[PDB]
Structures are given as C-alpha cells and as structure tokens.
Amino acid sequence: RFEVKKWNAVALWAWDNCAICRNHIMDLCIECQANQAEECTVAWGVCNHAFHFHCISRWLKTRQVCPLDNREWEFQKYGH
Amino acid sequence: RFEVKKWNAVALWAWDIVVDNCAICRNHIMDLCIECQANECTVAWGVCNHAFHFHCISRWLKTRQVCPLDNREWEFQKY
Amino acid sequence: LGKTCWEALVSPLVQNITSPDAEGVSALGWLLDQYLEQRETSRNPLSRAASFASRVRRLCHLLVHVEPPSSSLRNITQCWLSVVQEQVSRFLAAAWRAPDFVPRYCKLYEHLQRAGSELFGPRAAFMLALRSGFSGALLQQSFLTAAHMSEQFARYIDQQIQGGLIGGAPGVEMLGQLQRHLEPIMVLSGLELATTFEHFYQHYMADRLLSFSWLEGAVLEQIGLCFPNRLPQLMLQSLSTSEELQRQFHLFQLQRLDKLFLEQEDEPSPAISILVLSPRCWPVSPLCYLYHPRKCLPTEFCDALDRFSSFYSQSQNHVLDMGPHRRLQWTWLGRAELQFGKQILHVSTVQMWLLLKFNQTEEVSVETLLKDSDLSPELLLQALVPLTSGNGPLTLHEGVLRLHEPGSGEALWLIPPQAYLNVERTLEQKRNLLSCLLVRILKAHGEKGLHIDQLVCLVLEAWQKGPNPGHTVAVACTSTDVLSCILHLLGQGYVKR
Amino acid sequence: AGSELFGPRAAFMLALRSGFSGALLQQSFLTAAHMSEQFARYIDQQIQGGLIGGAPGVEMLGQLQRHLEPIMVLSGLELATTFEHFYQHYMADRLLSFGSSWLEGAVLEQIGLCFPNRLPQLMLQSLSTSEELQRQFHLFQLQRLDKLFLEQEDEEEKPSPAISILVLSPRCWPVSPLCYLYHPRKCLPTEFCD
Amino acid sequence: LLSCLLVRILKAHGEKGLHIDQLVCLVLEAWQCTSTDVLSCILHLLGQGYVKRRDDRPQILMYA
Amino acid sequence: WCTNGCDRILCRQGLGCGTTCSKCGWASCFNCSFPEAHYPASCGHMSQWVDDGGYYDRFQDYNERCTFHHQAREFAVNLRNRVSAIHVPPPRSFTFLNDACQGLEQARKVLAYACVYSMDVVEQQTENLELHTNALQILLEETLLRDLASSLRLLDCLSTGMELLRRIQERLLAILQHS
Ligand SMILES: [Zn+2]
Ligand SMILES: [Zn+2]
Ligand SMILES: [Zn+2]
Ligand SMILES: [Zn+2]
Ligand SMILES: [Zn+2]
Ligand SMILES: [Zn+2]
Ligand SMILES: [Zn+2]
Ligand SMILES: [Zn+2]
C-alpha cells in the first residue's frame, strides 16, 4: 500500500467595449460625446486591454492601477 | 606530475597611514568627500603625516593657510 | 446617537480591562495569553478548547470591529504588544543555547502572526505591535546572550546557503525555507544587534565568496536594511572593480607590446586570474598573509604576479602624485583546479602548494613543511585534514607524507569547510590598556597639549606599533575606542577643554 | 576586439549592438524561429543543470549570468514575440517541477524588459497570489466553525494527507484542453474530492 | 495571414490610414491572437518597406 | 535618571551608537537637568536659551525656523499614523516606512536644535543634513500621492530611499560624535 504525504493541485479560473465609459469599443468618448466637437485615440497597455485616452488620462490621474486587472498600468511602447 | 589548469590569486592593497577618518568632513576616508557625496575623490597627506581629502584640504586652504591639526604650514608632499 | 453610546459604553470598559494590575498583569492580557496555550491543542472539534477559542475570537472581533488616531484601539494594541513581548521573553530565556534556536524562533514568529490574524483579522497596526514586541523582547537581554544570538543567526544563514549550493535534490526545499524564514530576521534593524550581526555575516560571507556567487545578492536584496555600515554590499562592489581592473591590465599589456614593436621597427601555460580586495570592507587576518613569494612558489607564477604588481604601480600614477601610495600584499587565500591523471581535483592555495611539492619527490616531513611554510601550523593541520581523508591521495603516517596507491573520472572537490566560531573578560583589559596608554600620552605634553584628532593620531599610531615592545596583553582599535576612553577620562576630570 | 582597437568609448558599443541586431533581422522566418527556440532551450537547460547538479552546477551558473547580455539584444525586435512564446512553454514545466526559486526571479530581473507583454512575470506573481488565497481560505474556515459553535451554543442555551491548491490564470499559462479533469469524483478518491 | 489582413486593412483606408492602435483594434475585430502579435507583424512589414511611418503625424501610419 | 516617566537608570559605556531608555524610549543628557537631549548646544547654551525663553516641545527668524522644523516633525508623525491605520502590507515596504519615519523624526529634531544653536564650521553639517532630509521628504511625498494601501503595495526607488536613510544615519552619528 502507498500513503500520501503531500500534494499540489491545479485549476483555472474560467470566466468587450470601453468598459470604463461603456461606449462602443470603436466608438467615441462619452465625456467628450457630451461636448460634441471626438479627439480621444484608443490606448493599449501591457495587460492587453484597450481603453480611451480620455478615460485613462482621467482615471490614472485619480488612481494608479489598471481598473480591469489590478496591475500597475503600463503604457504599451512596443512596436511604436 | 601534478598539472595546474587554472589559478586564482588574492591580494590586498596597503596604505602607510592609520587615520581611517578625515577630520575636516568626519566621513570615512576611503569614502567620497561630502561635496562629492551630495551629487575622482583622492586622499592627500602632509609632511605633518596627516591625511585628508583632496577637496577637504583644498577648500580649507582656500579659507586658511595652516594645517587644521598641528598649527603648522602645509606641504603637498608629493612622490 | 451611535457614536455617543458606543464611546461612553466601550471606551471606559477597555480602559479598565486593559490596565495592568500591580502584579504586572491585566485581564484581556490573561485571556489572550490563555488563547495560545489552549490553541496548542485546540484542533479537536469536540473539546472544551474549541468553544473557548471560538468565544475569545468572537469577543475580540466584536471589540475591534468599530475602527475605520483611535481611542480604544491603542489600548488593545498595547495589550497585544505586552502579550507577545512576554511570550518571546519566556521562550528566549528557555532555549537560547539549544542547537536548534533559529528554526524554533522562526516557527514562534509564524505562530504568533497567524494567531494575531485569527484574533483580530487582517490589520497593519497589530503587525506593528508584533514587531515592536519582538524587538523589545530582544533588547532586555544580557550582552553575551545577544552575541550568541547574532552568531547563531549568521551561522544559520550561511549553512542554508551553502547547503543549497552544494545539495542538489533537497536544496530547493532549503532555499524555499530560507526565503520564508528571512522575514523574522528583519526585526534586528534598528538595534545594536545589527552592529554585532554584521560582523559575523562579514566573516562567513568572506569564506563563502572565496570558496564558491549569485544567490548572495538575492539574499542581500531583502536583508539589506539590517546592516548599518553596508559592508556586505561593498564586498560585491569590490569584486566588480577587480574584474574591471583585469580588463584594464590586458589593454595595458597590448599597449606595451605595441610600444616595443614600434621601437624595434623604428629603424601549455597555467591561466592565472588575480583578485584585489580593499581593506576597508574585507576581514583578513594578518596571519593569513604571504610574505616571501619566491620562498614558497614556482618561478613562472612569481613572474606573472610581479608583472601584475608592476602594472598596478604604474597605473597608480597621474593628481595622485600628491597623496599616499598603494601596494599589494599577497595572501594564501583563493582556489585552484588541477588535472591529475584521469581525475580533476579542486584545492585551495596552501593545498596546491603541498601538492605541487610532490612533483619531484615521494615524501616530505611535516616538520620540514612547517619550517619552510612560515605559517601557523594549526592552519597547516586544518588544510591537511581533507588531504589525509579517503578521497585525498595523501596520508601522513608516523609523521611523513606519502602517496595513496591507486585503486573513476569524477571531479573531486576537497576544500576545508568553514570553521564556525563560538562566543565564550577581554574587553575590561583592553579598555584598561588603552586608557593607561592614553594617560601617559597626555601626561607627556604638559600644557602644550594636543588636538582631539591629534591625540587620536598619536594613540592610533602607538597601538598600530602596539604596546608590545606582550601577547597576553596584545586587536585593532578604532576612533570609537579612542572617543570612548577619552569620555571616561573626561568623566574622571583628567582632561579639560 | 572593438575595445582594443578604438579604446573604450560609448558609441562603439552601441554600434556593436546595432550590428548584431541588423544581422539577426537579415534572416528567414523559419531560421528566426529555430534561433529563438534554441535560446529558450539554453536558458532552461542551464537552470535545470545548476539547480539539480552540484559543483559543476555552480560552475555553469556564473557562466549563465555572463551569457545573458548577448541574448538581451533581442528586445525591441520582431523576434521578441516568438522568443517569449517559446520561453513560456518551458517556464511552465519548470515551475510545476520546482517552486519559484531564486533562479527564475533573478534571470527575469536581468532580461525582463525583453518580453513584450510581460507574461513570465505574471506567472511568477500568480504563485504568490495563490499562497495569499490559501491564508484567506484558512480564515474563512475558522469563521464558518465559529458560526456553527454559536448556533449550537444558543440551542443549548435555549493522520490526514496535506493538500495545497493552485489557481492559474488562462491569460498567462499554456494549459492545453487535453489537460483537464471532467468527472472529478469518478477518477479520484472520496476525501480528496471532498 | 496577419500580414495579408493588415495589408488589406491599410489598403482600404487609403491615404488616410490610421493611428496604429486603431488599426490594431480593427484587425483584432476582424480576427473574429494578441495585440503584440499584430504589432510584430506590423514591424516586419515596415522593415520590408511595404508601409512607412507618417513623418508629419508619427502617430498614424501610411501605406506606400 | 530617566526623565519623560519610569524609574530605570541609564549609563553610557562608549559613544558607539547612542542610547535611549530601553523601556520608554527617551534620551536625555547626563550633564544638565533637562528632559530632552540637546546634541548641538552645550548645557550652558540650552540653559541660557530656556532662561531667556524660546520655542519648545535674526532672533525672530530663529523662532520661525524652529517652528518650521517642529511642524515637519509633526507631518512625519501624521504620516506614520495614517499608514498604521490601514485595514497587511508587504514586509519590505512596511519596515522601510517605519525606519524612514524614525529617521526623519530624529533628524528633524536634531536639526531644530542645531538651528537653536546660536572657529565653528558645523554650518556645512547642518546644510547637507537639511539637503538630505529634504530629498528624502520629497521622495516620500512623491510616493504618497490616491488610495494609500494600493500605493504602498505598489512600492526601485526604494533603493534610493535606503541610500538617503543611510546618509542621514551617518551624518547624525557624525554630529553626535563631533559635538
Ligand atoms: Zn471610454
Ligand atoms: Zn473621449
Ligand atoms: Zn488591464
Ligand atoms: Zn574629508
Ligand atoms: Zn570630493
Ligand atoms: Zn598637519
Ligand atoms: Zn525610561
Ligand atoms: Zn545638558
């Protein structure tokens, strides 16, 4: 017979517009959609989310984490 | 016989002084002087057999002309 | 209405139940002290201890659930501090001479932290209380106990690192345990224990670096704050500087060859690497020096060393003309690798010397070896112990050294292991001798006197030459010693300003 | 050779780096792929040998540290993505065979800015988050038991295998769908499944 | 495949093109892969000289 | 005797470190009767100042500078309280923050006394002490800015902070020994 002295198990946490302002992913920025005449380019970050430069500028000026995945936001500068 | 393939020798380097502390700036002599420390910093000694920072004694001599330890005249004893 | 009620009701109650009775004990302190003792065996669900622990848990959480400094949180935090301090004081007094001090210490830290998280939930203030309690418990101890504790901590760190580096299969477990256990040792920051602990860490890390790295930097990345004078990082900086110096030396050699070829045309070897150490941040006993190289070394090695020394001298030239000059004293430290027959052997420098002596001879007398060595023979026997073992091809029989007859293709790494030093009334005698020398020196100058740093220079020079014109009396003094002794003399009114 | 020729000066080292880069770019795609795979294998094999082996290991390890500065020329190029893809695939098995040692964190603190998306750092951080979750689960058990004791106390007033769990984000680990458990009770003993 | 999809996307926009991030969003939408993978394809294409970077507006990219 | 209090007695065997009371954590000089510890100014100078009267815890500018220093010390205390009152942080950040608070408090105290002070060249000592303390203050402030707990969990610059703290410690030891 055999006996178990220790063990390790594994599992995955299995579960898309601009969630922060909820406008359509390719659409414009609601903050500036109130003040019609649309200047926010989309911003990408290492954590692989796409948000509006306006949204992110404000939010980051408030807090310094990615609002979607709890990591320090890093403006993606690869390929640029 | 017995053949060597690699050797690593170890050496120390020795002064002729036992000061271990600059008087003008009160920092450990082998460390950098205060002004260099805030932001090539060498030690120099006199015939009075007192050692100091080059910069410490340079500033002190821009101020005065007597060695700050022995009430005597200074000599930048060279080699 | 809430604030009024809660304040008026609870805050007097805690202020009254956290006050230490004359015996030195309070009420919630007694309850929390009982908590750990019962938690020792409070795992069986059907037992009185289970109900007791649950009740204490609920009480403490209800008491603390109001916080968002504070009015009542201060007192409960101080009660936790007192409990932890008493617990650690008791345990520390119990087993401070055991051969397993440090694992028990770390386990106690873990138990206390988990208990705190269970009793009060995740909060930072209670962690601060725990750290302060451990510090306070450490402080109220006699000097020799503190010295022994520091030595044990350093020895533990060294043993774990060395085992991880040599031990392959369970070394990963040792390293993981080391990273887990590093956290309690950080308590020593902000105490004199830091000063006394840096010393032994220096002594052991010297041998570790010479014999074998990259894990030392990793350890220093988290134990960095503990060392006041930062000497351990200075050692690694020194290694990097030595590498740069070697590169410069190669470039200098090429330049000299170019100059020689220009002047002329104007009409199978051992690999030696040299490591230079600074005296500020490296402990080397002057008994480990090498004085006469040609007396105990072959000729090619001496030539290489001489040419490197010449390079160092010529490189010490420019504004540095005014100022002191640097030199090179060679030491018996270091490592060497030899290829004998099929096997590859690793030895130290002294062992390399002993071994290369047998190149053209079949026997040497230990008396002759020590006579020519000019070294303290205890070191010789220490270096001979691994040689005279089974793997070592040498045996000393009454004695004379002789070869081990043949009997495969595996590296043999034989080097003396670190000899840990144990702390056992010297300081009193040292202070007396320094003081007597001081009083004589200051008696010699009448009313002419000397400056404070002038008196320091004179006493330092005297001790460097040594009061010995002896061995019973005569260690190296520091400016701290001079200032301390002159403080005592000033207190005796023997010096004025 | 450059240092001997032109002395130590700044711009010539940058020239050397740019030369190596341009050479790696003037290559075919299959060959870029093979080269990246060779780099990943080299790192994995050195770490394996150094941790497992003894003194030959500690020998190999300082060399491993030396040889990283050539590798780091890859950053900012196209080859970064394929190199990172290959590196993830060995770091996975290495972490499941041995806990996250000093070695993986040190290698990453050297060559981290090469990986474009910072996947390996996220795997490492994942192991730590999982230990935190273990702490919280312990506390949660205690709270449940306290509620049970209280209810029963008001009504009255009226030798085991240790197991550790690890959660991994599928945004960072390459867990194949072939590697899954479907009817966990059926294929495992009773207490384990409990 | 990513290369040809990006080529088609750049050709459709003509002399207007896009900021690179917008183009990444377009290709990722057309996929139904990581943003970095698309950026790698973009860099390889740029090295091949099919596309260039708008000197006046470095944010946007211009096919040629 | 220990003055805050507590009945423990203090003795100083050498000037290697400098001591406070092991129990309560207070420092006073053995020479004159005064609760605090006055590093720069002699016991006679402090006696003259207190008999003439000054701030406590050209001539007008002195008082102004002393108030500024004590206010900065209050700021450091407030930062320590605010961090301590969070509902466990990473170990290295927490220990460094506690050490930085202690160092800043002691440095500001001794610097206030050095301001109170008035062939003396201690001016360079007080000057670079002010420089280093202000640098560390600015660093802590930069690492202070919305949610404190997340900010501390984030944090490197920690190395610069360690360097500055060592500098402050070395200079404080220098002032204490030289005085
Ligand atoms: Zn948006
Ligand atoms: Zn917008
Ligand atoms: Zn994100
Ligand atoms: Zn100086
Ligand atoms: Zn200088
Ligand atoms: Zn002089
Ligand atoms: Zn006291
Ligand atoms: Zn006084």
Author numbering:
A (entry chain D): 21 to 35, 40 to 61, 66 to 108
B (entry chain C): 21 to 59, 67 to 106
C (entry chain A): 1367 to 1434, 1465 to 1608, 1611 to 1665, 1691 to 1741, 1743 to 1822, 1830 to 1838, 1842 to 1858, 1863 to 1907, ...
D (entry chain B): 1511 to 1668, 1691 to 1726
E (entry chain B): 1871 to 1902, 1921 to 1952
F (entry chain A): 2159 to 2162, 2165 to 2217, 2292 to 2321, 2323 to 2353, 2362 to 2388, 2391 to 2400, 2403 to 2426
The article reads:
However, the vertebrate-specific CUL9 complex with RBX1 (also called ROC1), of interest due to its tumor suppressive interaction with TP53, uniquely encompasses both cullin–RING and RBR domains. However, the vertebrate-specific CUL9 is unique in encompassing two distinct types of E3 ligase within the same polypeptide. With 2,517 residues, CUL9 is the largest cullin and RBR protein, and among the dozen largest E3 ligase subunits, and its structural mechanisms have remained elusive.
A 3.6 Å resolution map over this region allowed building and refining atomic models for the two CUL9–RBX1 protomers in a dimeric subcomplex. Although the two CUL9–RBX1 protomers in this refined map, referred to as A and B, superimpose over most of their length, they diverge in arrangement of some CRL (CUL9 WHB and RBX1 RING domains) and all ARIH-RBR elements. However, the remainder of ARIH-RBR domains were visible in protomer B, while only the Ariadne domain—a key regulatory element—was observed in protomer A. The disparate conformations of the two protomers arises from a striking difference in their molecular composition: protomer A is unneddylated; CUL9’s K1881 is modified by NEDD8 in protomer B. CUL9 K1881 corresponds to the WHB domain site that is neddylated in canonical cullins. The neddylated protomer B shows an activated conformation. NEDD8’s I44 patch binds CUL9’s UBA-like (UBAL) domain to mold the RBR domain into the active E3 configuration. First, the neddylated WHB domain is rotated roughly 35° and translated about 10 Å away from the cullin scaffold. The neddylated protomer B showed additional density associated with the RING1 domain that could not be attributed to CUL9 or RBX1.
